[PDB]
Structure formats: structure tokens, C-alpha cells
Amino acid sequence: MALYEEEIEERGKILVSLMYSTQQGGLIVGIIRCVHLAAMDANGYSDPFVKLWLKPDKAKHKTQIKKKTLNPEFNEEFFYDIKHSDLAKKSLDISVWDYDIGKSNDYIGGCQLGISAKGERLKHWYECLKNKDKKIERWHQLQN
Ligand SMILES: [Ca+2]
Ligand SMILES: [Ca+2]
């Protein structure tokens, strides 16, 4: 609306699955859900959606927009055609956004999963690289 209705350390957590499928020849990325997202509207909620970019590259995907929730349930899967060893060249940028109708979308937070990450985000990538045809599901902290 017109009276700033669509306008914080804890940004939320995201549950992500990674599976390299040898039958299909590529990476399946699952965006399952987020929990305790930052509220980026005055009603105390957000309208979240998630964007994926497989860097450095078809490289991009996005989820649907869920309305008025800090705990969006997406259960959506995305596919990238890629050789397994070429995943060792890439990193997946994940960003979470609050859709607004009358202004720019608000940034909730993000995380990078891939070779230029650190800590548990790096390890998640490595577990997918080391384990073909296993679904590796982990929770990550969103960062600003
Ligand atoms: Ca907003
Ligand atoms: Ca909104």
C-alpha cells in the first residue's frame, strides 16, 4: 500500500537437499522449507521466495511465492544438467526474498553452498560431490 505497509540479526534457516543423479546426469536441488524468517512487512510477516544461481554460469531458478508466512513450505525441486566432476567448479548462490506488490522486494538473507563456501556450507557440497545418488539434506543459517 502507500503508508509503508510493506516495509535484525536472526534472518532464518533454510532446509536444502542436494543429490547428484547418475541416471539423469545432473544435480537435483531441493528447497524444502524455511523457518523463522525475518519479517519484512509491517504485519509481522513476509511473502517469501527463493532464487538459485549456479555460479559462475539456465544457471538460474526460483521458487513460487508463499504468502504471509515466516515458515514457508516450498517442497520444490530443480535440476541442473552438469557432469559430476564439473560440480567441483561451481557454487550455488541461494537468496531468500520477501515479495512486495508496491515496492522493491526485500532481501531476507542468503547462503552460498559450494566450493567458495566455508564450514558446514562447504561440507554439504563436498558430501554431494563424494556421494553420487544420495540425497544430502541439511539446515543452513541465512546470512545478511
Ligand atoms: Ca516487505
Ligand atoms: Ca511482502
Side-chain angles (χ1 to χ4, degrees), residues 73-88 90-111 113-118:
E73 187 73 4
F74 299 108
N75 294 299
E76 281 191 62
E77 288 189 347
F78 304 98
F79 182 76
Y80 291 106
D81 282 297
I82 190 174
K83 287 185 52 180
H84 174 85
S85 53
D86 285 338
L87 274 177
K90 312 294 185 195
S91 195
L92 187 67
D93 189 284
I94 305 175
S95 59
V96 183
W97 299 86
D98 155 50
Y99 177 80
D100 289 339
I101 301 166
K103 53 180 283 306
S104 291
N105 300 329
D106 287 316
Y107 178 72
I108 297 171
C111 69
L113 298 190
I115 64 176
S116 283
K118 295 198 194 140

Side-chain angles (χ1 to χ4, degrees), residues 36-50 52-56 59-61 63-66 69-76:
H36 220 240
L37 292 178
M40 296 307 277
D41 302 319
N43 55 13
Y45 294 93
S46 293
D47 303 292
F49 70 96
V50 184
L52 294 189
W53 170 37
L54 188 69
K55 301 194 291 179
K60 295 187 177 244
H61 297 283
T63 69
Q64 81 195 279
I65 298 154
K66 294 297 191 172
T69 182
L70 302 181
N71 314 126
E73 187 73 4
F74 299 108
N75 294 299
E76 281 191 62

